Swiss-Prot record:
The keyword Signal applies. Changing A28V: Linked to development of dementing Gerstmann-Straussler disease. Monomer and homodimer. Has a tendency to aggregate into amyloid fibrils containing a cross-beta spine, formed by a steric zipper of superposed beta-strands. Soluble oligomers may represent an intermediate stage on the path to fibril formation. Copper binding may promote oligomerization. Interacts with GRB2, APP, ERI3/PRNPIP and SYN1. Mislocalized cytosolically exposed PrP interacts with MGRN1; this interaction alters MGRN1 subcellular location and causes lysosomal enlargement. Interacts with KIAA1191. Interacts with ADGRG6. The gene is PRNP. This is Major prion protein. The chain holds residues 91 to 231 of 253 of the full protein.
Length: 142
């Protein structure tokens, strides 16, 4: 539940504003695709925790790290050039399944929780996509 609202007794004037986490451009544009039927999960990968710009989040990572989505669904090295778009839509789905399921099972990843996953995952989907990318460079092709 989130009420979708936000109110309460006059907020007691606490400390002033300071430096907030900085984004990173927009990372939000076209999203065309083609059609499902291409999501195969490779193996589990243990990658360092991600970073957003706050100590609170970092803590969350250390809190559910062992629970941090350590797997990623995606289309095998087979591709043409959409390597960044592949991972992109991959974590999008790896998260779509772990998020909807968190819900299908009754769990609930907090918006933060999900950001964590989306990065760590996109990082995982890329990590393996890379390891295999090289495996392809050696696989017959030079």
């Amino acid at each position: 539940m989130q009420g979708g609202g936000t109110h309460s007794q006059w907020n007691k004037p606490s400390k002033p504003k300071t430096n907030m986490k900085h984004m990173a451009g927009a990372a939000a544009a076209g999203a065309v695709v083609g059609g499902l039927g291409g999501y195969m999960l490779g193996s589990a990968m243990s990658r360092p925790i991600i970073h957003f710009g706050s100590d609170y989040e970092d803590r969350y990572y250390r809190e559910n790290m062992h629970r941090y989505p350590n797997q990623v669904y995606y289309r095998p090295m087979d591709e043409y050039s959409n390597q960044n778009n592949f991972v992109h839509d991959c974590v999008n789905i790896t998260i779509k399944q772990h998020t909807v399921t968190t819900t299908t099972k009754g769990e609930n990843f907090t918006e933060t929780d999900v950001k964590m996953m989306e990065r760590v995952v996109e990082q995982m989907c890329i990590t393996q996509y890379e390891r295999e990318s090289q495996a392809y460079y050696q696989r017959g092709s030079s």
